[PDB]
Each structure stands twice: as C-alpha cells, then as structure tokens.
C-alpha cells in the first residue's frame, strides 16, 4: 500500500505469535520490539538514537509478518516506547520512500 | 525520486544557507537538526527518542531545501546524533511510504 505521512506510519505486525502495532521507521537501522517473552537464543546489545541508548536482547532470524508481508531477520527486544520496524526488515517487504 | 532502504535514506539539505546531510525519517514526528547557528527566534522545547528526552530550540517557519525540494516549517535544533527530516517536512515535499 501507499502510506501518507500526515500521521505516524503504523501497521499491524505479527511476532512470536502476537499481533502488535508497529511504526515503519526509515530512520531506524534496526527493528526494535517492546519487551516480550520471546523464546530463543539471544545476545545483549545497546542501541542508540535521540536521548541515548537502551539495552536490548538481540534475536537472530526472527520471522515477523508486516502488514501481510513476511520478513525474517534480526529483532531487538527491550524497553522501547513504540514497536519499530527498521530498514533491515523494510527492505524485505519492498518498502520505498517516494516524493 | 524513489528511495530504497538498503542504505540509510540520506539527502543533502540547505538550512540557514548552509548545506548539510540529513536522514529522511518516517519515524520522527519532527525535524531535528544538530547544533548550529540558525537565523531567527526560537523557544525551548523537549523531545523524546529511543534513549530518552533532550532539550531543543524550536524554530518556526524555517525555509529549508530537502534534496532539491523546498519546505518551510518547524525545525528543532539540538544534540541529535543525526540530522533528521521528520514527517512535518516530509509531508511538505510530498513523501509517501510504499510497498
Ligand atoms: C516539537 C515537539 C513535539 C513533541 C515531542 N515529540 C516527540 O518527542 C516525538 C514522539 N519524537 C519522535 O518522533 C522521535 C524523533 C524526534 C522528534 O520527532 O521530535 N522519533 C524517534 O526517536 C524514532 C523512534 C521513536 C518514535 C516515536 C516515539 C518514540 C521513539 N527514532 C528515530 C531514530 C533516528 C536516528 C537517526 C536518530 N532512530 C533510532 O533511534 C534507531 N536507532 C538507530 O537506527 C541506530 N542504530 C543509529 C541511529 C543513531 N545513531 C547514533 N546514535 N550514532 C532505533 C529506533 C533503533 C514530544 N516531546 O513528545
């Protein structure tokens, strides 16, 4: 679909068997999902942005369906304010910025 | 143009007559530029990101050229790790997310 930017570009995603609301963020290199008890092997990571850093658990090869579109890659789980779909997955669903 | 996301969506901008590199950020409500001297009146404001809240100078009705496209709006100046063009200006240049 085509998403206008008058409001935050939020779409429904599915991860770990749960449906969530997520923000399509062209300014995020990574995908960060709110704290959830996702099973699997992980490694500690620190991610930054405006305001500083937050500690997250990095999960490799996690499948997430984004607005009906399947993707698979690295997902960071931690105390993020909103669910963020970054470029690592955006490229997988064929998302582009157009103007 | 159509911008894919394999690489960060960086563009050249012109603000205060000075050229800079900025990231087209669909996940940012506002446009936040690194500390710089900008002609005009400003008011103290606080914004939040992934790592926390930071203090910024809010400049209203600023003329800024984004990748050759002109926009005139709110620009926040502060300690941001990267110059970001948020939705307030992305809508002005007619940017949409597509997939
Ligand atoms: C005028 C005031 C308006 C009101 C004001 N509004 C805000 O604070 C709103 C919610 N903030 C935002 O929309 C801010 C951007 C700042 C802004 O627009 O003001 N957005 C953001 O901060 C969004 C995530 C988010 C979205 C909504 C809510 C909370 C967080 N992240 C944008 C950000 C861009 C980056 C280049 C700086 N990306 C990231 O932080 C991602 N990080 C990365 O991709 C890193 N790997 C590399 C970038 C950082 N580099 C570095 N540290 N050397 C992260 C999500 C994995 C308020 N106080 O509520």
Method: X-ray
DSSP A17: T
Quoted resolution (Å): 1.9
How many C-alpha atoms does A43 have within 13 Å on its Cβ side? 3
**Domain count across chain A:** 1
The answer to whether B56 and B47 are in contact (CB under 8 A) is yes
Q: Is A50 in the pocket of ligand 1 (CB under 6 A)?
A: yes
DSSP B95: -
Distance from Cα A85 to the centre of ligand 1, integer Å: 13
Pocket test of ligand 1: the residue of B27, B62, B75 to mutate, having most ligand atoms within 8 Å of its CB, is: B27
The answer to whether B62 and B72 are in contact (CB under 8 A) is yes
SS3 B12: strand
A69 lies in which domain range? 1-99
CATH number for the domain spanning B31: value is: 2.40.70.10
């Amino acid at each position: 679909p085509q998403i206008t930017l008058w409001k935050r570009p939020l779409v429904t995603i599915k991860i770990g068997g749960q449906l969530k609301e997520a923000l399509l963020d062209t300014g995020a290199d990574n995908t960060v999902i709110e704290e959830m008890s996702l099973p699997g092997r992980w490694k500690p990571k620190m991610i930054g942005g405006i305001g500083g850093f937050i500690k997250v658990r990095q999960y490799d090869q996690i499948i997430i369906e984004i607005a009906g579109h399947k993707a698979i890659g690295t997902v960071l789980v931690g105390p993020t304010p909103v669910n963020i779909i970054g470029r690592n997955l955006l490229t997988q669903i064929g998302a582009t910025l157009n103007f």
